[PDB]
Amino acid sequence: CYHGNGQSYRGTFSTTVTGRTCQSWSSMTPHRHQRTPENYPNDGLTMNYCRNPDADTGPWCFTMDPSIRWEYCNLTRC
Known part of the structure; x- marks a missing residue:
């Protein structure tokens, strides 16, 4: 979980809400x-x-x- 709007979130969780995997911010693939x-x-x-x-x-x-541009992550507002 995260606080506020999770601006400070610097955790190692990378699974979308729908169980989808997070793309590396560096990579231009797929989005x-x-x-x-x-x-x-x-x-x-x-x-x-x-x-x-x-x-x-x-x-x-x-x-x-490739179908899903982005999504929230499977976290909770601490």
Whole structure:
């Protein structure tokens, strides 16, 4: 679990809500994006971990599902 909007979340959980696997923020595969550790160095954008680099309402991620752009992660607001 995370606190607030999980802005501070820097945990190693990477499974979407639907049991789908989180894509690595570095990788442009399958979802091509700009939320990179490279564009946002102080965000926690490590590997495929779940983060909220964007003032979302909980920690989310880009999905390894070519069909699913992104989703929240299977976490709970501590």
